[PDB]
Every structure is written in C-alpha cells, then in structure tokens.
C-alpha cells in the first residue's frame, strides 16, 4: 500500500465518502476522507492557480486556490509529517474523471524543498519549474492517461483530438527525482509547490478533480482509483 | 511611534516585563511582552542559527533556533499580519546589552519575501544573502553601535579592540531596500529569514539579546531602548 | 562624471555618433559609442524581452533581445569589468525620446547578482523581481519623467493621459539598494538581468531607445542627455 | 558511443595524450584531448572549489578552481553547445586513479540550469544542492567505485577503511533527473555548477583527476576508462 499525502481540488461532492455538499479544497492524509476541507467555487473554463506551503516548525500544511478575479479559498491543517511520510518521497500531480468529466490541464508547475540539518545548515535543496511541457518531457514520469506537449501543456486525463474530455479517466505526473522530505536529524524541513490549471466541462457536473501529492518513491496508480478516488487511494477508508 | 514585529532571542529574563524565568525565544507584536515564548538553552560562545518562517495562508509565524549539537527550540504564533504591519516595511537585526553584557555577532544573514497577487502571479520577490560583511557594506543601514567588517562579521553592539563586550550598548542593521510585505490584493504573501550568530560573555548573566524585526520603513532606534528593550520598543507596555 | 556601463536598445540610428544604419543592440562602456553592436529588427507595438548576462570567469558581457515570433538579436563583448566599474554600483533602466518619439514601457524587470569570495564561498547575493509596478513603488528610485503604476507598468518616459508619447523626454528607474558588483578578493562575480518592454510609435521613426545600465551609486541623469544620449552620458565622446 | 562534454581537473600530466607538462584545468569536448587548458597548482590535502558557467548568448564555457589561500586558475572556450550535446542530458561528477592515486572526495555539489523559450519566458529551470551525502542518497545515480555517506561526503573512487586511496579506480555520480539543456526554440539556455573537493595523496604524483561532465541521458562508464581517461572516454582520440 502506497503512503499518500495530498491536497485535493475536488470538483465533485461525493457525500458518500465524506465529501462536502459542494466543490472544495481539502487536505488528505492517508485517506480519501479529507482531514479538513473548505468551500471552493470552481470556475468552469477559467485558469486557476494553486499554492501549497508547509514547514516543519509551524508543522502546518496550508493551501490556497485563486482566480484572477480575486476569488480564492484556503485551507490549513496542523500536522507533523515526520510522523506520516517516509524520509524519501516523490511529488506529483494527479487527476481523474468519473461518470462525469472535465479536462484536467496543467499549464505550469514549480516546486521547492529544503532540509537544514543538525549540522547547522549544510542545507540540501531542490527546485524545479515547468512553464511549458514538450511532447517528450524526460524529467517527468507519466502514469495513466497523462500526456505532455499538447499546446505546451500537461493533460493529466484523456482528451480526444477535438478537445473533448473523456470519462472514467485517470492520470498522474511525478517529478523524476526523489525528494528528501525529512530527516530525524533535520532542524527544519520546508517546502512549497505551485501549479496553474484549467478545468473545463461541456456537460453537467464536472468531476472528479485534481490533486497535488507526495508519496513513497515507488508509488503507482492504485487499481480502480479513477473517478472519486482521484488516482490516489485504493479505497474510501 | 514605530510599528514593530519581531522574533527575540532573549538571553536575559526580565520577569518585571513578563519575561520567563529563563532565556527564551519569543514572538513580539508591537510589544516587548512576547505574545508567545519557549524555553531556550543558550550556549555561551557557541555559534547558533535562527530561522524564521511565515505565510499568509496558514497565517502562522514560526521560529527555530538550533546549535550543531542538536539542541533546538521552536515557537509559533497564529497571527494575521495584514492587520498589524504597514503594506511596506523594512527588515533588520537588532541587539543590545544591559547592566550585563555579551557580544552580539552576526556571521551571516539571508532573507526571502514573495507576493503573489490577485492578478494570478505576476509575482514580486526579494532575496538577499550576506555570508560576509565588509568594512563598508553599502546595502546595510547601520544604526547605533553596529559595525561591519570585523573578522568579516557584523557586530551589532559595541566591542572593544581586544574583543571585550561593552555594557549599555544597542545597535541595529537594516536592509537598504524597503520590502513590500503585503497587499490587500495579494493572494499569498510569504517570507523566511535566516541568520547565524555568536553570543559570548566573560562575566555572569549575559544580556540582553538579539532580535530579527520588521518595522515601518522609516523606523529608527527608540530612545532608551538599550538593555531589556532590545533596541526595538520605547517602553514595556 | 558618472561611470556608466550599459546595454542599449537603440531604436534610432544617429550615424553622427557612430550608430549603425539601422536600429540595433549595443554594448556601451563609458561611451555612447557602442564597443559592439548588432542589427535589431524592432517590432513597433509588440512586447519584447531582453536578457543580459555576465560572469567574471569568461569576462564576457552578453545580451539578447527576442520577440514571441522567434526574431532575436544577440551581442557579446569581451571585457573585464573589474577594470571599469567601481566596486559598488547601482543598476537601472533608462529611456529617452528625442525629435522623434515612442512609449518606453517596462512590463517587468528582474535581476540577480552573486559574489563568491577568496574565502571560498560565504557567498553574497541579491535578487529582485518586479512583474507589476504600483503607483508608489518604494524600492525604485525614479528619475526624470519615469512613472509607475499606469496599467501596473513602469513608464520610463512621458506619456499623456490618452497614451500618446511625448518628445524630448528622459527617464530612469534604479533599484533602491546598492549592489556589490566586484571585489578584488572575489573569485567569481556574476550577474544577469531580464526585462520585458513595449515600444510604440504613432509617427515616423521612433527614437531614441531604452538601456539597462550599471553606474556609480550616486549617479543621476546627466544634463541634456535626452534623445540620442539615452539619459546616460553627458556627451558623445 | 556516449557524447561527453566535461571540465577536467587533471592532476596528472599524460603528455602522450596532449596533456600539458603540469596539472591543469581543461575543457574537453567529445575528446580526452582538451580544447583548452590552463596551468593549475594543485594543493595536496587542501579543500578546493570549482565553479562552471555557460550561457547560450555568449556561447562561452568558463571554469575556475580556487583555494582559500587565494590561488585560482581559470579557463574559457568559445563553443556553441547547441551543436554538440543532445537536447536532453544528464550531469555528473567523475573521478579516477591510475598507476598513481589520490582520494577523490566531493564535499558538496550544486547545479542550476534554465531555458527561456521562443514563447518569451514560460521558463523551465532546475536547481539542486548537496552539502552532505548520506549513505543512501536516492537522488544520485552512483557508478563504479563511487560511494556516499562516509563522513557525509561523496567518495568518487575507492578508499579503504583506514582512508588510504586505491589505485586503478574509477567512479561517477550523476543527478537522478535528466536535464533539458537546449531547445531549438529556446532563446536562452544557461547553466552553472559548483562543487567542493578534497584531493589527497600519500605517495608521489597523484592521479588522475576529477571532472564535472554532461552526457547523453543513458551514459555509463566506458570500459577501461580508469586512470588518465577519467571515466569519461573510451579512448584518447
Ligand atoms: Ca471526489
Ligand atoms: Ca530582555
Ligand atoms: Ca540613438
Ligand atoms: Ca590525466
Ligand atoms: Mn473530497
Ligand atoms: Mn522577552
Ligand atoms: Mn548606439
Ligand atoms: Mn588533460
């Protein structure tokens, strides 16, 4: 079983799994049932931006999603990740469609992570930035229906030639290099991630959403994790 | 009256002002009376490192001080700085000595601040790093007894030719450029700061401490702010 | 007399001062007479981007200007800046108009500079980024006709209410903090700068151009340095 | 056959392969026979620092090696890498010993690479920094005799339990993620790399040296490339 920590933009309220009554941001720790959520007003066909922040001092995971018109939603959860994740992890983006559907299109993604040790600095750090994705992007590991290069963007879930989103689709993109997320001997571990995205739906009720996630290095898409499970978890426990 | 927000390494417990019974880290908002403190075991003559982190999402100010031997102390306080500081500020370091004394020596200082707007990025950012200070460091504004260039370090308070710390001393160093700390239209404002320091005392009970601070751009040392007031505040209110 | 090193985007050929027979990029060292130039096809009304790069190892100053359509021009010149500039400098943008005119609009500007010493690192560095300029941008020093905040941009030369460029105009913007550009004891000093710009003209030939420059810290606009002198030099020597 | 571009710190002059009559820095393009070299006074047992810089504008590859005592050597070579390397590459460190020997210890290594496209920015970038290496450093690919974790350092070539260097040894470390080094449509591609190293020898002349290199993504150590071939090239052509 993979170990997953994620921030979800959940466009589809499955109330059966503890989802709220409306599209939402949520913080998911080893469960599809968010530890915390906040109401999110999703704008169809508009380009949004998500920022994720964490530091080992405050031990608080925070996320915000905003649109150029000023609408934004934030969620924060107090958690000590030293106690959750493995020392080494990979980070990525995941997206799905269900019975209902949407394009899950990533326009850009950047990430920064830092470890300052008991050695008093001698800091290790990683930063990457993608503002365009080519057809062969060798520094990304693509899983599922994810493709790169279409209009210089990353399409996480299946889209036809004419731009129409497909249902029952799942895809993920992980950064090629492993990340050293924490160390018992680290005095501070902190990271932030940013991505811009475009969700569009022709039909009623888009679903199911997009998530930024951190997993064990060897993580792969759990079976039947399409739709409401967001390509992250094998079940709703 | 200046507006001050600071993180204090308070080596001297003035219990009269609400200081704890022991040297401590503290978070000070417009008052010398910390909103929150944590016990700190100060190691005389050892080089320490302080990290300060804040983000507008979690709205939590965090600080940690550590030594190479693994000892560290952390403190966090939930605060919305949009409601405290002016839109534009300056950042700096301050240090003092009282009746008792210590060297306040800064070995290195770095800082990073970012504003992502309602414009959806078009981000503004500032970063600077000093790992050595020359005799004339033009990008620093020195106030009080602060000097640069001695052994490539920044000495915040008065030290004689032979290295002996002087009492009743106060000094500050501010970065030359103003910083845009928040904007009503900003979706995220975040910053972090790091500095390494060396506190040494020949006599009993070093005092009074060192602080990292953010103030209105025109801030200058309040009169009689030496000793326990840390060159920050005009009084103990 | 100021000491000026600049990269010019010269939209107007003043053959009398050694300018080429067409708009051009040029490298100017202590003279309006470029040490090296390259032909530049300026696109009226289009948004361009300039990048400038230098390092103390190769001791080569390089610049490129490009447009989204793929047109670009580059120029490089071998030079040891240790022998030209003062140890401490300021960096800025300058623009002018003359008998002929153009808007000199800066959309964004970023800069990074680093000094790695004989101390083996203990590196000092500065980075800033502006992707929007507000009406009161405290970390910029504005000289001449330069204004900030109009459509979130920086307008270096005078523009009327209705958007019409004015003739015989000059303006500069300098970053507020001084920059430590070289040190006798530095093993490497390197910097890069980037800005995006929009030049528009209603009338016949636009003039006179925009430059990125580095000067002594107290540099101010030389008298009569409008038009072909680009606000940088007091004469054409 | 791999495609290799490297900067060599050649501690052993093999005059038979065009090496100079003294230890030297060199720039090697697809050949062990440096295109350019500079005399290098290697200090046995001292910690050195190497910096490497390149940009697509100046199209000049530069390198400097320095020690804390102020001794340094630099070498530069004009080259258009667009015409040499594949679009995607990996970067790494290599070292060898031969008949003669030395420790090839890396203390720290950082790297930054950036591509600004014809799209006008939408920049892609990668940065990493190692200031300590643990026993299991998952973001490094180790080849040959290379090991990590001994005193928090990276030992590229074989060293016994007691610290004694072994002869006829070769080892390399490559960053785990591929790097997009150029693109036909990029307006600027630039990178820099820095590492600190410790070379020690008990016996008479140390050999054979350490190199920073860029290769095709699937590059592996060519057979018999120990000693003077530095683990990079299959022959001396
Ligand atoms: Ca769902
Ligand atoms: Ca006190
Ligand atoms: Ca001109
Ligand atoms: Ca050799
Ligand atoms: Mn949910
Ligand atoms: Mn206190
Ligand atoms: Mn000219
Ligand atoms: Mn050689």
Short mmCIF file of C-alpha atoms and ligand atoms in Angstrom, two decimals, chain D residues 8 10 12 14 17-20 24-26 28 32-34 37 228 230, ligand 8:
data_model
loop_
_atom_site.label_atom_id
_atom_site.label_comp_id
_atom_site.label_asym_id
_atom_site.label_seq_id
_atom_site.Cartn_x
_atom_site.Cartn_y
_atom_site.Cartn_z
CA UNK D 8 38.64 18.37 -16.10
CA UNK D 10 43.70 16.86 -14.39
CA UNK D 12 48.38 14.05 -13.75
CA UNK D 14 49.87 12.44 -19.58
CA UNK D 17 47.52 12.35 -24.82
CA UNK D 18 48.17 16.06 -25.28
CA UNK D 19 48.11 16.82 -21.56
CA UNK D 20 50.34 19.75 -20.52
CA UNK D 24 45.82 21.68 -15.23
CA UNK D 25 42.24 22.69 -15.74
CA UNK D 26 40.85 21.78 -19.14
CA UNK D 28 37.07 18.62 -23.08
CA UNK D 32 40.12 13.47 -23.74
CA UNK D 33 42.29 15.97 -25.60
CA UNK D 34 41.27 19.27 -24.04
CA UNK D 37 43.84 24.12 -20.76
CA UNK D 228 44.10 9.02 -17.49
CA UNK D 230 38.94 9.96 -16.23
MN1 LIG E 8 44.06 16.84 -19.76
#
